[PDB]
């Protein structure tokens, strides 16, 4: 389970993310699209060129939802209920893809944090991102 | 297969890699983030905590050897399958490591490289390196 | 590779398989047990419920074709990689189906075969058939 | 989430399992060992020959725990807490293996139920076995 120490490590890193929600979100999305091109088929309506308005606007929305999750870590299901119905019932997102985006997010974090993205920090975010992923896919179970 | 550009993203970044540091990092992170992997290292001594793992000499030395092995893929990008055949038998028949863990170590290495080379580890670079660890994971699962 | 005994477990059981029935079962079960797979069948019409899926003519016909395809592996156990190369390009480049789903369909087929052939689907038979679906999943992930 | 209908479908099939806990448990374990030989390394102390006392005794224990889980489906974590600490802290069981055993259990069920192991029944057990697996591995998160 997420410990208090995990939460603190998460918050310390997150307040930085919040200062550039758009930049981080877009970078995580673009790494996913470039590294795992199959994920692009979920966004046919999007102009997927580097830094497109759609990607930037969406990146901020993703970061925004993750920020809300950080704020309500003990009440994820309820907090993401609307998003869970969306990704499962409407978008039919393959669970595997949540892991791909979570991973790309960690890469963005690692790149921006340098030596501050310690193993302890990675653990906390891994736990966090895995919990968020589980909720966004619970409608399949 | 590998495009000249991909090969460049791999060889140029690797020439700057501190194998011992990145190797120890990747292995310590594997044992810490996915604790069940500790099952395979009962002889390495104390692994009772994240700090214990990061200060475990054997864990660090081993990661060095693992990343050195990855180096053999970087140095012969077209014969990865043949290069790891021996290690494949070792991890399967002898160690019985589920293949899924090969993918997890690969992912960890990707993240470590990102924390060490933020400027050079662009999305395109990540794509080339992800292709690399995946190929090693595939060859080992053989 | 395949041992004469394994090949016998495969060919003998398959000669008794009702391709249309098992195929429809496997596909309907894929869409029902792992609903995100429905994403790839938007043109098949109503898939709004388990019952709707089991009565979907297109879903049934398609499963028949899928199991027929599996039949081509059974009929040429040593050239599976070559036999599915075309379908591999189709599911990847064209359909963009994550490879993990190939493994899930394989697992479903294993369970279906068990419900249809309890007497013959022994642990040893399951081992041979699991090797089969895995090889098809591997060839398609190519 | 597990619906009431899922629970009923599960119970109907389970009362049959309870009549031969030992037979079912052993069959599921042996299929795992034979189909996925790597899982055998977790049981070096066991005589793994067909129907060995150790396999039969263990199979019944596994079925027994699953039976308890069926009985307390709304309180899994607490009910399996002791088993979760065991599989994670003591045995270091790779999460992947819970999926392998869950799958082999479904094969045993399918074989014994025939046409009664409908897609609806499979869904219910898939949900159930996945939930039990998540709990037995939660100590890793
Ligand atoms: C870290 C896990 C994820 C979170 C927190 C998340 C969050 C969100 C949010 C909040 C929206 C709605 C934005 C709005 O209201 O405009 C959204 C939309 C969407 N998401 Fe995700 N998402 C995640 C993962 C994924 C994955 C893995 C995929 C598949 C590759 C995906 C595909 C989509 C699509 C197609 C939309 C529709 C957006 C549009 O049309 O603008 N998401 N997501
Ligand atoms: C897919 C990336 C991997 C590569 C390239 C790799 C490479 C190697 C190499 C070269 C050795 C021999 C050490 C020596 O030089 O003496 C080794 C040993 C070993 N590996 Fe890996 N390995 C990988 C992944 C894993 C994973 C995922 C596990 C399981 C958690 C694992 C468990 C082991 C164990 C237990 C040994 C024996 C070391 C000892 O007994 O001291 N490896 N590996
Ligand atoms: C690994 C086992 C699989 C085999 C052997 C297989 C085989 C085939 C074959 C032979 C076709 C061509 C149908 C025709 O005869 O016209 C096909 C089509 C297709 N498959 Fe698969 N397939 C497999 C798994 C999957 C999976 C896991 C998915 C994703 C859920 C998938 C999605 C599709 C789709 C969308 C089509 C196109 C059908 C249409 O547009 O009507 N397949 N497959
Ligand atoms: C359906 C999921 C599982 C359940 C409900 C379960 C349940 C149990 C229970 C209740 C015990 C203790 C028996 C006793 O008190 O004598 C046990 C022991 C054990 N389990 Fe599991 N288990 C599961 C999956 C696994 C998996 C996937 C593995 C790895 C292949 C595994 C390996 C072991 C081992 C090594 C023991 C020690 C037993 C002994 O030494 O007799 N289990 N399990």
Chain centroid to CA A28: how far? 8
Closest ligand 4 atom, CA of D42?
35
CA distance C70 to A46: 37
Whether residue B62 is annotated as binding a ligand: the answer is yes
- Whether the CB of D7 is below 8 Å from some CB of chain A: the reply is no
Q: Do the Cβ atoms of A95 and C36 come within 8 Å?
A: yes
| CB of A128 less than 8 A from some CB of B | no
Backbone dihedral region of C49: left (phi > 0), alpha (psi from -120 to 50 degrees) or beta? beta
Rounded to the nearest 5 percent, the helix, strand and coil shares of chain A are: 85, 0, 15
A84 lines ligand 1 (CB under 6 A): no
* Smallest CA separation from ligand 4 atom 30, residue: D39
Among D9, D31, D38, D126, which would you mutate to test the C interface (most chain C Cβ atoms within 10 Å of its Cβ)? D31
Contacts of D36 (CB under 8 A, 6+ apart): D97, D100, D104
Q: Which residue, among A95, A101, A92, has the nearest Cα to A129 in the 3D structure?
A: A101
Q: Which of these CATH numbers, 1.25.40.10, 1.10.490.10, 1.20.140.10, 3.30.930.10, describes C1-142?
A: 1.10.490.10
Gap from CA of A87 to ligand 1 centroid (Å): 7
Residue B91 among known ligand-binding residues = yes
Number of cross-chain residue pairs from C and D with Cβ atoms under 8 Å apart: 57
Resolution (angstroms) equals: 2.0
Helix/strand/coil (H/E/C) assignment for every residue in chain B: CCCHHHHHHHHHHHCCCCHHHHHHHHHHHHHHHCHHHHHHHHHHCCCCCHHHHHCCHHHHHHHHHHHHHHHHHHCCCCCHHHHHHHHHHHHHHHCCCCCHHHHHHHHHHHHHHHHHCCCCCCHHHHHHHHHHHHHHHHHHHC
The topology under which CATH files domain D1-141 is: Globin-like (1.10.490)
Tell me the C-alpha distance between D91 and B74, whole Å: 36
Kindly report the protein residue whose alpha carbon is nearest to atom 17 of ligand 1: A62
B50 has a chain A CB within 8 A of its CB: yes
Taking the centre of ligand 1 as the mean of its atom positions, its distance from the CA of residue A65, in whole angstroms, is 9
Q: How far is the CA of D104 from the centre of ligand 4 (A)?
A: 14
Q: Report CB contact under 8 Å: D93, B36.
A: yes
Show the tokens assigned to C102. Answer: 């190939």
Q: Is the CB of D95 inside 8 Å of chain B's CB atoms?
A: yes
Distance C91 CA to ligand 3 centre (A): 7
Q: Which residues contact C130 (CB under 8 A, 6 or more apart)?
A: C106, C110, D35
Residues with CB under 6 A from ligand 2: B 37, 40-41, 65-66, 69-70, 87, 91, 95, 97, 101-102, 105, 136-137, 140
A130 touches chain D (CB under 8 A): yes
Closest ligand relative to B103 C-alpha: 2
* Rounded-to-integer distance, Cα A59 and Cα A49, Å: 14
Using left for φ > 0, alpha for ψ between -120 and 50, and beta otherwise, residue D51 falls in left
Angstrom distance (rounded) from CA D11 to CA D17: 10
């Amino acid at each position: 389970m997420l410990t208090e120490d995990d939460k603190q490590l998460i918050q310390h890193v997150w307040e930085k993310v919040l200062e550039h929600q758009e930049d981080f979100g877009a970078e995580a999305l673009e790494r996913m699209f470039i590294v795992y091109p199959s994920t692009k088929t979920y966004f046919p309506h999007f102009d997927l060129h580097h830094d497109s308005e759609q990607i930037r606007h969406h990146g901020k929305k993703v970061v925004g939802a993750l920020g809300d999750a950080v704020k309500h870590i003990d009440n994820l299901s309820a907090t993401l209920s609307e998003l869970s119905n969306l990704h499962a019932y409407n978008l039919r997102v393959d669970p595997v893809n949540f892991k791909l985006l979570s991973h790309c997010f960690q890469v963005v974090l690692g790149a921006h944090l340098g030596r501050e993205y310690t193993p302890q920090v990675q653990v906390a975010y891994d736990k966090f991102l895995a919990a968020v992923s589980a909720v966004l896919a619970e409608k399949y179970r | 297969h590998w495009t000249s550009e991909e090969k460049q993203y791999i060889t140029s970044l690797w020439a700057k890699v501190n194998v011992g540091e990145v190797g120890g990092e990747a292995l310590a992170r594997l044992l810490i983030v996915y604790p069940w992997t500790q099952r395979f290292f009962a002889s390495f001594g104390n692994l009772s905590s994240a700090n214990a793992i990061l200060h475990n000499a054997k864990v660090l030395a081993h990661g060095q050897k693992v990343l050195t092995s990855f180096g053999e893929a970087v140095k012969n990008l077209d014969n990865i399958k043949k290069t790891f055949a021996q290690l494949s038998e070792l991890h399967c028949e002898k160690l019985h490591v589920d293949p899924e863990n090969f993918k997890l170590l690969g992912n960890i290495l990707i993240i470590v490289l990102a924390t060490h080379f933020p400027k050079e580890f662009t999305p395109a670079s990540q794509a080339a390196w992800t292709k690399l660890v995946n190929a090693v994971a595939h060859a080992l699962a053989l």
